Amino acid sequence: MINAIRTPDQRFSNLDQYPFSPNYLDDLPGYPGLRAHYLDEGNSDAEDVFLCLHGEPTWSYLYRKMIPVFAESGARVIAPDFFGFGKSDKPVDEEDYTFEFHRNFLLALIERLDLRNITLVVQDWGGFLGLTLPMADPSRFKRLIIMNACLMTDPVTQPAFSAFVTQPADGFTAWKYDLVTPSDLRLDQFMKRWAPTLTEAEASAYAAPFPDTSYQAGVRKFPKMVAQRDQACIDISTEAISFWQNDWNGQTFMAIGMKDKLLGPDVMYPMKALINGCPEPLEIADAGHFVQEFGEQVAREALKHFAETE
Template identity: 50%
Template structure:
């Protein structure tokens, strides 16, 4: 079994805007994954995947809009994030470890008529899943993210972020979120830090920048290359793209390149004031997504 930490529940008791009921799935590796499961099961299922260093709290502005329209929202916390278990050893966290855990959740909940909602690592991982089970997915809402194919040079913005991340293993997450999203209250910014009592809980957060495939033979690259082919040739669902235009790492140039890969991708919704964490400007995104889907 994998040795893991579990954040005390009381750290989540008074988070602003996050009055959702927790759900848990214990996977074959013995780790417990937390996920939100809101709304009715009669409509579409919006599967909302977060990235680094966030967790399902990121979707609190969008979830009520989707559920009010009669849809279901499932928003998991990746292992190492949020209310999910956090393996102690950084080496546990790998591209396939995270991807396999998401596939296991989709199968365990038997999700169908899924609109895949992704941003940051939610996309690097999530965009590789529909090719494995295309019958489950009917839509894609894609925000600032990319495919880690390993055969496209990494941007200088990302290389700078990775270097900074490696120099700061005890990342000050609340401060980072408030710099990226100046409209957050102090309490909202602190909520992003809630899952991590100390740096021992941040292994998953630390690992992600070093998991981005940076060569064609890097772990995850071949899977991402196959996914690129899927989105180019085989995708038949409805797509919406929203771009936080002030993102220095996964902003307009990266997203414009991704749009060319996704078959049938319409012109994106551009959010001039939004940065990397597009969901923090998510009310407009969710409302326009409902009209699209």
């Protein structure tokens, strides 16, 4: 077993606008002794499944405005919390978190739930990882909703997907500094800074998973993996580019949080060009990195775009 701890359930007692019932998978292949939490909303026998993947330092709570919109369209919605996050178990050592640790978890979850007709919904690490899934099992994937995200390839193959790491100083550089440096990391305060439109109660929901620093190893490791990409990550991410460019023929919808200093237009337009058939992006002027906080619009517009060419 990996050494891991579990957030007490009382931490989730008073969440704001998260009425979604918990589902758990324990002992997924390759993850013995670890319990993963996921939401499973809407018609369980739906033809379509929206697989909503979160990023750093969030959890399925981030999708709370989108889930009801997708479910009311008649689709199923699966929103897992990565190990280290949300209501999932949390390995205590940063060394146990790797790109493939997280990627293989998603593949295991997809196989375990036998998800098909997937609309992949991604942002940040949900995208860095999620965008590498379809090439592993392409017949399971039907559509893509992409918000502020890209692929963790090397600087030479796609400079746009590395330049943001070092400029602007107040972008990823500040984000990483905020996450990896404090001994007492307060994610409510972090999230209010990086999503300034959050209410206090919403911000508290992002601190909920983390009673203390011992629960935050996954949180600390994510930004380090953006700055230092292992060979497996580079290879897998580069292969993914070829998939979206050359193999993908599904329906696609893009939305950009225009105030994002990390993964805004300078990353998302290059990403648009690499995704075969990706339409003009929906630009959300007021949205920052956490586009899902303006997510009702994204979900509604994506559904209309998809209805238009079913």
